[PDB]
């Protein structure tokens, strides 16, 4: 309350504001650093949020508005405002990184945070200094750290944009803010805002599929961003959204490039062509009224063809497409509401049908051709993710149980696996780590019984794939095989499509009573 009044005052002070501009910032930074000291020797992460909102964001916004005076050129404009920016930015960066260094200097976070985190932050190295994973204060410390990493990320993104001459950005231009954001996501994956800011980076490089995916992750994490759905909608649902208009331009560029079959083109088709398909289900009106509207069947056929023919070098993007799509079904429900009409039930059903069409295509043309592949985790990881999703939602389970194509596909896969009770393990796999706090799979992939992990040592490292007991790629593949056979058998137990275990063959066959 009284704290809120103080930061509003910082904002108003800076709005009124060569040298005295830096002076004002220094004074405000000095007070904030002092609040943070009093907080750390529940206020901490709140102090940092009010800092971003009332002090830093309004500054960065002004540089944006001004930069956009340049592009609509102003050479004398670019370097001049880039000069005053470089007077201010090191202070902003210091406010957040000081807090990190402060935090890591007082307390041991190894009970809550991966051990190599200090290393990654170039932070150098008592019994009571070790924070227990359940105290309120321990949570406040980690959240404070996450905020520092988050706002360093945003600041870095803003700088890169100003430091750029054109609105053309190569892939690795945002490498530095992406690293900070990656670390922020790692230590508290529940926070949607980290994914949101990552997606904003990808909008600059025009990786709109990566952007959509990050926007979906930001809307569906256990603590989602409020800007998650607005940005998703700006990209896929708003005829007048700047992101949407850009998407259409990208689809233009791809249209004229479809004849080329360089990997880079196959990859971009898989990143982009799923977008209009998802768009048309969630935002049907928007995707009936544009220049690409009559190309919807084309997008799907080419997407599916690229997946069948070109999955080997592009499997990582196919994996992303799967999660985006699963997430998009819940985007659909949040955006279009609880189904009520006969028509709204059928629209929702049509989307689910398309989703399972994608599943069976993945299973039939990709995973079935790669279930022995011990080198790439993605093949069997995709099967785990489908099953974990399906077991998480009654409506989805019922659709899946009654889907003949999907049940047939799982029978074929399960039978191949059988030809190769509940499994356990000592650490998280790649796909586990990626989907931590993802809502549609209920925040953790629950096909394994990770019950005992909590009683094991080095738990934070275990939950980011690091342990003394790391298995070979082969062993990890074997572990996925077991959990898939187990989940698939549980799923098939009550399927409604006539599939049953032939107890002589010990394989699944199709049956009927007559």
């Amino acid at each position: 309350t009284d704290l809120q009044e103080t930061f509003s005052g910082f904002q108003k002070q800076l709005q009124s504001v060569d040298s005295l501009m830096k002076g004002a910032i220094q004074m405000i930074h000095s007070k904030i650093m002092q609040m943070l000291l009093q907080s750390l020797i529940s206020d901490a992460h709140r102090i940092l949020d009010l800092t971003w909102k009332h002090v830093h964001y309004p500054i960065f916004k002004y540089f944006q508005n001004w930069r956009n005076r340049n592009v609509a050129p102003n050479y004398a404009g670019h370097r001049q405002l880039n000069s005053i920016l470089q007077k201010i930015f090191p202070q902003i960066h210091k406010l957040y990184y000081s807090t990190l260094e402060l935090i890591f200097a007082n307390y041991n976070l190894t009970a809550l945070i991966p051990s190599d985190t200090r290393s990654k932050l170039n932070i150098s190295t008592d019994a009571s200094n070790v924070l227990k994973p359940e105290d309120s204060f321990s949570i406040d410390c980690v959240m404070a750290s996450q905020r520092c990493l988050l706002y360093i990320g945003c600041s870095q993104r803003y700088k890169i944009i100003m430091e750029h001459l054109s609105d053309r950005y190569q892939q690795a231009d945002f490498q530095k803010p992406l690293r900070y954001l990656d670390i922020a996501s790692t230590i508290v994956p529940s926070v949607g805002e980290t994914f949101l800011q990552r997606g904003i980076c990808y909008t600059h490089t025009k990786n709109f599929g990566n952007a959509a995916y990050q926007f979906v992750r930001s809307s569906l994490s256990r603590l989602p961003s409020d800007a998650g759905i607005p940005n998703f909608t700006n990209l896929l649902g708003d005829p007048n959204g700047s992101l949407f208009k850009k998407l259409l331009n990208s689809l233009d560029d791809l249209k004229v490039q479809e004849t080329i079959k360089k990997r880079i083109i196959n990859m971009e088709i898989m990143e982009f062509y799923i977008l209009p398909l998802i768009g048309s289900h969630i935002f049907p009106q928007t995707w009936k009224n544009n220049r690409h509207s009559d190309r919807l069947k084309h997008f799907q056929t080419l997407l599916f063809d690229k997946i069948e023919i070109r999955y080997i070098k592009n499997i990582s993007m196919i994996f992303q497409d799967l999660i985006l799509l699963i997430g998009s079904f819940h985007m659909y429900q949040m955006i279009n509401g609880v189904s009520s009409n006969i028509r709204s039930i059928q629209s929702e059903t049509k989307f689910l049908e398309f989703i399972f069409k994608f599943f069976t295509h993945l299973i039939d043309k990709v995973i079935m051709k790669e279930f022995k592949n011990c080198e790439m985790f993605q093949y069997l990881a995709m099967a785990r993710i489908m099953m974990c999703w399906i077991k998480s939602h009654k409506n989805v389970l019922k659709f899946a149980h009654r889907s003949t194509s999907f049940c047939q596909s799982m029978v074929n896969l399960t039978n191949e696996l059988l030809s190769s009770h509940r499994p356990t393990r000592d650490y998280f796999y790649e796909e586990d780590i990626m989907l931590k706090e993802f809502g549609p799979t209920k925040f953790t992939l629950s096909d394994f019984n990770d019950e005992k992990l909590l009683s094991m040592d080095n738990l934070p490292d275990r939950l980011v794939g690091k342990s003394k007991n790391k298995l070979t790629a082969k062993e990890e593949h074997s572990s996925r095989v077991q959990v898939l056979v187990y989940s698939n058998k549980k799923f098939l137990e009550k399927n409604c499509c006539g599939f049953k275990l032939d107890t002589e063959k010990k394989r699944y066959v199709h049956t009927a009573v007559k």
């Binding site: 809550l112 508290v188 994956p189 077991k391 389970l397 953790t444 990770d450 549980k490 799923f491 009550k494």
Partner: peptide, 17 residues
């Protein structure tokens, strides 16, 4: 009431709950 950190501690294919 709500802990933002990842907690490993808390259906398996039954249509009936």
């Amino acid at each position: 009431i709500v802990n933002p950190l990842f907690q490993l501690g808390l259906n398996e294919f039954d249509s009936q709950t």
